[PDB]
Design a protein around this ligand. Sequence first.
Ligand SMILES: Oc1ccc2c(c1)O[C@H](c1ccc(OCCN3CC(CF)C3)cc1)C1=C2CCOc2cc(O)ccc21
Ligand SMILES: Oc1ccc2c(c1)O[C@H](c1ccc(OCCN3CC(CF)C3)cc1)C1=C2CCOc2cc(O)ccc21
Lengths: 235, 220
Amino acid sequence: LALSLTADQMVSALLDAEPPILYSEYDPTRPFSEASMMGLLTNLADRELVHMINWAKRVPGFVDLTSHDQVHLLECAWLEILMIGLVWRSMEHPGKLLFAPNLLLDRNQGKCVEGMVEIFDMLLATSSRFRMMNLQGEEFVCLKSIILLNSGVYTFSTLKSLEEKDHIHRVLDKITDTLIHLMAKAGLTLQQQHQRLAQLLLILSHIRHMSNKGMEHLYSMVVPSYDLLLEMLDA
Amino acid sequence: LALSLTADQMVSALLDAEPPILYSEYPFSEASMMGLLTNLADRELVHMINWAKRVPGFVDLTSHDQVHLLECAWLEILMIGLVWRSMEHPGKLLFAPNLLLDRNQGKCVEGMVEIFDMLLATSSRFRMMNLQGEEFVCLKSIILLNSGVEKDHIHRVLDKITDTLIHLMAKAGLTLQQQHQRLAQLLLILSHIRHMSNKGMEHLYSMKPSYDLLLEMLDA
Ligand SMILES: Oc1ccc2c(c1)O[C@H](c1ccc(OCCN3CC(CF)C3)cc1)C1=C2CCOc2cc(O)ccc21
Ligand SMILES: Oc1ccc2c(c1)O[C@H](c1ccc(OCCN3CC(CF)C3)cc1)C1=C2CCOc2cc(O)ccc21
């Protein structure tokens, strides 16, 4: 039962599910070329993908879905989930993106790739906004799980798929309750609780925009197949 | 003035700024569907600039900031308006009252059948939620101010529209649990709306607004 958990239990599951922080390929030729930077970043994302699937299976409600729909959700969300992880890692490094512990890149180093400096500016801006809002890890892991579930749910049809959508909205309602509980426990007024909830959820639309602009720039210079995701889930 | 508004003043202001539903101009099946939709889009744009000026707090921003917000939000604003008025026509998109299209007519343009399916799903989602017209106008204003984001003024105004949405839900008679849940349900659709807008721009660069263009329109 996924919809049985209390708000306090839900936070433990999400924090226990959290994937590890990984390193980039140790000691590349620095400084980077456009080819070598895209090599290291690609190397990192593909290794992070494996821990995202293991994370995804531990997110309450996800394993209850069919395998086909689990792939669909991850196929829509995987870049947004990498991006918010980056933005979260970066928080306490103003003007810098912490891709890995050994790969802290400032704004000016995005220039190497060309077109990329646009994407860096957007990722940095999101991290500034999180620093402005004083985003907490309990709130952060809740927003990641909302991205995983929400960002592919609209494209689903029979009585099976109707229940599958309804189930997802029920878990999304559960994660909303869990976000508000944390804000109430922290001692914000109801007016502030609602105001903060809205501000957090409106940042997910900017993350989607960053994801799309990111996908376009990646095709400008591969993207994860249905078979790779299914293989990683069952095995 | 904008920061001092009550929920009813905000809603009534947004309902009275609401632009009109226009028509496509075409008469046999001579058609050319893309130019027909572009003719519509361009005429709708002109009403959007005047709708934007009547949104509380927007006029208090510098005309540099007003152009940046509309440059980012124009296509989402057209889409939510299309999706809102398609609500009572499952399977069809009501571009104009004389231009109601089904998903087979979406295949008339190469690539757009993908975009059609997302727009019908958004409409399908609005129907399943019983999205109300007071909530609809609030969400358009949110899209205008959010997609681009002096900066703290914008966030102060967005906090008022959150207060407004919650007031309408409480007025409607929702429990506190249902209020904050329904708020989240509406604001998470904006993420899907943004995604559709990004897909639409890419699709339009296969077929077919500048910084100058929007600034020129805003002054008059
Ligand atoms: O031009 C770029 C635009 C955006 C990015 C970027 C480059 O660098 C990486 C990247 C991402 C995906 C990718 O995927 C390539 C396709 N792989 C192959 C398939 C698995 F086999 C998925 C290759 C490289 C990257 C971003 C966005 C910022 O957020 C990140 C956060 C992370 O934690 C890790 C990486 C990124
Ligand atoms: O491939 C397409 C992808 C998306 C659309 C579409 C075609 O049809 C029109 C469209 C939009 C803009 C455009 O452009 C207007 C002109 N350009 C030049 C610049 C100055 F105005 C903008 C030309 C055509 C359209 C959509 C999205 C669905 O929502 C709509 C709602 C409306 O109320 C009106 C139009 C649309």
